[PDB]
Amino acid sequence: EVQLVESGGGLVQPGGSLRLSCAASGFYISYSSIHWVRQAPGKGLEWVASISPSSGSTYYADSVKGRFTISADTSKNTAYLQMNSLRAEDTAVYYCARSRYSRYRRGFDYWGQGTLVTVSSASTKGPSVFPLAPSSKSTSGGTAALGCLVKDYFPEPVTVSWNSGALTSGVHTFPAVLQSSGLYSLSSVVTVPSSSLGTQTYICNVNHKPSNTKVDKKVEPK
Amino acid sequence: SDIQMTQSPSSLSASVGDRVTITCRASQSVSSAVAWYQQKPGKAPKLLIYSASSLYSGVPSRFSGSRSGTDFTLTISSLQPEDFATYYCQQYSSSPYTFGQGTKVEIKRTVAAPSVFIFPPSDEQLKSGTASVVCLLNNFYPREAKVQWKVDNALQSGNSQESVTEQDSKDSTYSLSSTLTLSKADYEKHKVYACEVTHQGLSSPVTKSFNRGEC
RNA sequence: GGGUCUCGCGGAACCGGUGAGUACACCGGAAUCCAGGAAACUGGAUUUGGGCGUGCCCCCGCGAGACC
Numbered sequence: 001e002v003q004l005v006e007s008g009g010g011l012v013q014p015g016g017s018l019r020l021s022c023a024a025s026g027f028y029i030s031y032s033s034i035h036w037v038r039q040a041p042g043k044g045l046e047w048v049a050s051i052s053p054s055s056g057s058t059y060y061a062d063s064v065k066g067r068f069t070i071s072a073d074t075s076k077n078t079a080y081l082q083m084n085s086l087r088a089e090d091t092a093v094y095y096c097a098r099s100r101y102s103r104y105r106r107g108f109d110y111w112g113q114g115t116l117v118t119v120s121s122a123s124t125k126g127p128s129v130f131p132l133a134p135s136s137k138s139t140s141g142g143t144a145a146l147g148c149l150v151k152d153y154f155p156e157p158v159t160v161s162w163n164s165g166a167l168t169s170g171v172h173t174f175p176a177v178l179q180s181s182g183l184y185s186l187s188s189v190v191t192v193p194s195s196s197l198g199t200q201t202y203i204c205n206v207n208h209k210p211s212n213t214k215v216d217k218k219v220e221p222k
Numbered sequence: 223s224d225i226q227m228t229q230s231p232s233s234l235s236a237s238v239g240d241r242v243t244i245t246c247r248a249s250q251s252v253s254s255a256v257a258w259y260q261q262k263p264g265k266a267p268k269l270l271i272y273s274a275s276s277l278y279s280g281v282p283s284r285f286s287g288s289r290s291g292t293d294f295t296l297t298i299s300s301l302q303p304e305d306f307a308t309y310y311c312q313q314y315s316s317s318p319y320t321f322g323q324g325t326k327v328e329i330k331r332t333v334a335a336p337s338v339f340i341f342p343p344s345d346e347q348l349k350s351g352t353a354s355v356v357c358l359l360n361n362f363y364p365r366e367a368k369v370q371w372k373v374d375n376a377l378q379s380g381n382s383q384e385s386v387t388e389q390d391s392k393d394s395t396y397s398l399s400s401t402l403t404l405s406k407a408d409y410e411k412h413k414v415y416a417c418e419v420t421h422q423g424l425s426s427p428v429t430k431s432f433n434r435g436e437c
Numbered sequence: 438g439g440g441u442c443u444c445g446c447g448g449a450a451c452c453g454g455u456g457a458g459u460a461c462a463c464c465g466g467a468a469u470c471c472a473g474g475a476a477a478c479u480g481g482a483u484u485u486g487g488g489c490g491u492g493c494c495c496c497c498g499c500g501a502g503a504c505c
Contacts, residue, residue, distance in 0.1 A: 028459090109272070
C-alpha cells in the first residue's frame with residue numbers, strides 16, 4: 001500500500017543548510033498534498049510546511065517563513081524541505097505526512113517514520129561498544145541478563161539489534177542520556193535463559209550511521 | 223488568527239478496561255476538521271479519528287470521537303495495555319494546521335517488584351581509562367524507584383545517571399538502568415561495588431554487588 | 438445546417454465512500470417536486486461533468502469573430 005520515507009537529516013552547525021527528502025510509494029503525490037511536521041525532542045507536533053503538486057501551492061508556518069522552502073519532483077514522486085539559516089530551535093525529528101482534500105478530508109492520514117535534524121556545533125563521534133557480561137555469581141531465577149554499553153557517541157541515533165535480528169524478546173534498549181561531557185551513552189540489555197549461556201552466542205549489533213561505526217560485539221561470561 | 227487547540231488533560235493514568243476521555247477545545251470553530259492521532263514513543267503518529275467522529279480504517283472500535291461545537295472528545299472505551307501512548311488532536315480546517323499539546327496516557331497496573339542485576343566494567347573499557355558500573359532494574363511497576371550506589375559502604379553522589387524505558391506495551395512495566403562512572407584510578411582503589419534498590423514492591427531494599435575481580 | 442483557433446455564456450446543494458490516474462467510472466446518504474399529518478417527518482416521483490488543500494484547471498454544451 002502507501003509508504004513515506006524521509007531522508008537527509010543529520011547534524012548541522014548553526015546557520016547551516018540541510019535538504020530533506022521524502023520518498024513516496026503506493027500513491028502519486030501529484031494527486032495529494034505532502035506536509036512536513038517536526039517534533040522537537042520531548043515536545044509536541046508542529047506543522048511547518050505543505051505542498052500540493054497538482055496546484056503548485058506551498059504553505060509555511062511563520063516559524064519557518066523564508067528559511068525553509070518546500071518543493072516536489074512529481075516524476076521522482078518525492079518531496080523536499082530546504083532548510084537555511086538553521087538554529088537550535090530547529091532541532092527536531094522531521095516527519096513527512098500525506099493529506100488529501102478533494103477526494104477525502106482525513107487530516108494527515110499517513111506519516112513517515114521521521115528523520116532527526118540536530119543543530120549543534122559539536123561534531124560527529126562514533127561510540128565505544130563495551131560488553132555487559134552476565135554476572136559470574138548469579139542472576140534472577142533461571143534467567144540471566146547481559147547487555148551492551150554504547151558509550152560516547154554524537155549525535156543521536158544509534159541502532160542496537162541482537163544476534164543479527166534473531167533476538168528481540170526480552171530486549172530493553174534504554175533511551176540515550178546526554179552525559180556531562182556532551183556525548184550520549186546508552187545500554188541495551190536482554191534477559192535469556194541461563195542455560196543458553198553455554199549454547200547460544202549473544203552478539204549486539206551497533207550501528208551509528210552519522211560516523212559509519214558498525215560494531216558487532218560478542219557478549220560472553222567473564 | 224492561528225487556531226489554537228487546547229487539549230486536556232496533560233497526562234492521566236488509568237487501568238485496563240477503563241474508559242479514558244481526552245478533550246480538545248478549538249479556539250475558533252473548526253467545523254469538524256479535527257483529527258486524533260496516537261503516537262507511541264519514538265514511532266510515527268497514527269491517525270485514529272478524522273472529521274471529529276469517523277473511525278479511520280484499521281483502528282479498533284474502542285476508539286471514538288465526538289464534537290459539541292468547538293469541544294472535541296476522544297474516548298477509549300476499554301483501555302488496553304497497548305494503548306499506552308501520547309494522543310493528539312489536530313484541526314485541519316485551515317493552515318497553519320495546529321495540534322493539541324498532547325496527552326500522555328499511562329497504564330496503571332498492579333505493583334511489580336524489580337529484578338536487579340549489576341554489571342562490572344569490561345576489561346576492554348578499563349583499558350580506555352574509564353570504568354562504567356551498570357545496575358539494571360527490570361520489569362517493575364510503578365515507575366518511582368530509588369537506586370543508590372555504594373563503593374566500600376561509601377555512598378556515591380553526582381557520578382551516576384539513570385535512564386528509564388517507556389512503559390511496556392504488553393505488561394505495562396518499566397525498566398531502569400543506573401550507570402556509575404569512575405576513573406580507572408578510582409575504580410581500582412575499592413573492592414565492593416553495590417547497587418541498592420528501593421521500590422514499592424520490595425518489602426526491604428535489595429542490594430546487588432560484586433567484588434572487583436571476579437572471573 | 439460542417440471542420441479548426443480565439444473570445445463570450447453556461448453545465449442543482451450538502452455529506453460520505455469505492456475502483457482508476459488524470460481531470461474518468463461508480464455506490465450511498467441526501468435534496469427537489471407532489472400528496473398527507475400538529476409534527477422531528479411519511480409516502481410517491483425525480484434529481485446535479487470532473488481534477489486538485491480551493492481558485493484555478495480539464496472536459497462538455499451554446500453563442501460571436503477570424504481561418505478553411
